[PDB]
């Protein structure tokens, strides 16, 4: 349309912020497992990729939609974002490269920027509703 072409950018950015959010919480949750190799993604490059290409999430298949009572089930799905390794400091004898301070400052930053995106969408949508009344 032309309603979801002007709000598209903030919608995509905010969804990408949520995706990076559960990536970072997977970093946090695996704080003390051995050999974890903390992951992260590049937000700017991935956002440009999303705007140019689309979603194109890779890997996921649900069952079919026959008559009712056929037990829906789904495969393991993952966004098409290419997970990047976080360059570690302080080797730790168990491979776990999850630094609490790095992961946690990134978590707080990502949270704040997600809230900023929510504010921007709220402003744009309130503007639309203020025009139409």
């Amino acid at each position: 349309d032309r309603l979801d072409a002007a709000l598209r950018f903030q919608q995509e950015a905010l969804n990408l912020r949520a995706q990076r959010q559960e990536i970072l919480a997977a970093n946090i949750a695996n704080a003390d497992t051995p050999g974890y190799q903390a992951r992260d993604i590049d937000f700017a490059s991935e956002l440009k990729k999303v705007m140019v290409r689309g979603r194109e999430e890779t890997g996921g298949v649900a069952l079919t939609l026959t008559s009712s009572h056929h037990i829906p089930a789904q495969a393991v799905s993952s966004p098409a974002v290419d997970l990047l390794y976080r360059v570690p400091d302080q080797p730790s004898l168990d491979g776990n490269t999850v630094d609490m301070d790095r992961e946690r400052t990134q978590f707080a930053d990502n949270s704040l920027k997600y809230q900023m995106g929510l504010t921007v969408l709220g402003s744009q949508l309130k503007g639309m509703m203020n025009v139409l009344q």
Binding site: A6, Q124, G127, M128, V131, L132
Partner: peptide, 12 residues
């Protein structure tokens, strides 16, 4: 015009 004035000039 930018999701502002469009739908002002139209409704008016």
């Amino acid at each position: 015009w930018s999701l502002s004035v469009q739908t002002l000039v139209f409704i008016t």
